[PDB]
């Protein structure tokens, strides 16, 4: 629930070639882009800064710039001891989540080769067992550097909650707006003779939660597969609900859409 987090992806090809990308997301709307060439931060929304002053924004930007510059070099330095096999990928995600009831929880997680590597709780080692031996090794070394751990703890449990509250309050207008969902119907080639598929597309809605059901009057017809809620530029969502049925029973069927933006005025599409 409204978990602001920054993410980083580093790809190491050879002993001297490595790329790094980063971005800060509110929930799934990208807020901060990162030009790693010049090491600058792009604020993609007017309220990307929250209530933070520009000075602390510059401080945070410089901290992230130095970290981005140095991460690849340090990983290359230690890959010999850690027996990394090239090429490989290192992913990281760190941020703070606002649970319902005003309980902000901070988190940090890392992964190598798509497998979990480590995490922090109360600013400490948690080597995930998937990372195996080396995992523990790494974080053990990381324990030694007190300054890095202090910076991580400060950014996690002292700055992230402040920033999250700031953006949630500042971006109030954009966060809690409502847009009516468009909807339409289409046919689909289904397996089996004397068979058909009905697809109810609902698009352009926000916020994400939505209830779409293929119903025969009020019979509450089952067998409705709801595909994953695909994203869509302009910051709305799209979703197709499919139903398989033999030909002939198509009459008396309708897809019903309930969303917060409709304030109880449900959408009914007859077929």
């Amino acid at each position: 629930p409204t978990s602001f987090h920054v993410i980083q992806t580093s790809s190491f090809t050879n002993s001297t070639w490595a790329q790094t990308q980063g971005s800060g997301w509110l929930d799934d709307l990208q807020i901060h882009g990162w030009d790693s060439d010049s090491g600058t931060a792009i604020f993609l929304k007017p309220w990307s800064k929250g209530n933070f002053s520009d000075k602390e924004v510059a401080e945070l930007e410089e901290i992230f710039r130095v970290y981005i510059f140095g991460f690849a070099r340090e990983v290359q330095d230690f890959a010999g001891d850690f027996q990394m096999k090239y090429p490989f990928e290192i992913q990281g995600i760190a941020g703070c989540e606002l649970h319902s009831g005003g309980a902000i929880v901070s988190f940090l997680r890392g992964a190598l080769g798509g497998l979990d590597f480590l995490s922090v709780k109360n600013a400490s080692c948690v080597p995930s067992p998937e990372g195996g031996s080396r995992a523990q090794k790494f974080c053990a070394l990381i324990i030694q550097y007190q300054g890095i751990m202090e910076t991580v703890r400060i950014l996690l449990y002292e700055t992230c909650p402040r920033y999250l509250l700031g953006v949630l309050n500042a971006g109030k207008a954009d966060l809690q707006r409502q847009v009516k969902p468009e909807a339409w119907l289409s046919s689909g080639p289904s397996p089996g003779p004397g068979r058909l598929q009905l697809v109810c597309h609902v698009s352009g809605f926000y916020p994400k939660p939505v209830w779409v059901m293929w119903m025969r009057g009020e019979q509450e017809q089952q067998g409705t597969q709801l595909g994953d809620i695909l994203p869509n530029a302009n910051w709305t969502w799209y979703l197709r609900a499919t139903l398989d049925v033999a030909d002939g029973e198509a009459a008396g069927l309708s897809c019903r859409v309930k969303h917060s933006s409709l304030e109880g005025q449900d959408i009914i599409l007859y077929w």
Partner: T-cell receptor
Amino acid sequence: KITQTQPGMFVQEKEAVTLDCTYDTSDQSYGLFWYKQPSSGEMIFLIYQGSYDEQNATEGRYSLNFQKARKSANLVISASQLGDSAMYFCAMRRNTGRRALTFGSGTRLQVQP
Amino acid sequence: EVTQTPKHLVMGMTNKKSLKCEQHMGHRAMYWYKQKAKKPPELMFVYSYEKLSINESVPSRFSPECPNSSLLNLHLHALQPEDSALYLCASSHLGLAGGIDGTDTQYFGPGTRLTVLE
């Protein structure tokens, strides 16, 4: 910012002088440095005290009077010699700061024989 | 130690000169400081991992450059009389290489007394 608030200090030879340096940063987890610049110009590192080190760092003839609560850490030179006549700066580096030193106004010290 | 040749420099308003700072301790980060008359040093540039990380609104006449990892030049051209001061180069460790002690002390070099003249 760091305020030395001292025009210049004078002290007889073979005595102790307490150079003052008061900072105003409310953030914890920082690092306090002292640098000496003789008349030639080069800056010579003197001593360093971490914020959390819970101990007044001592090195050679230079001691420290770091009081975190009062936001002051006065460098203490014991048994001052004639070579200790130089510019003295009190820089501070923060954990979430500029990643580079930030010097105060500095205080001239002129030990006399 | 850090070497900062040339130790002295007298320049006109159209000449082009260069300042070379070189350290062989292989620290990581390098800095450029400018100190005026009877003033604390002021930061100018910071190079972390041979990449410029801080530019404190320095005008475009100064053109820093870090070719190697143990070298940091500074090219000047068409300066102005107010740009006469003492320029110091500093070096310091960075993370994961300075060891357990995360002091990151800065070691300065013998500054260059640049006095420009119209």
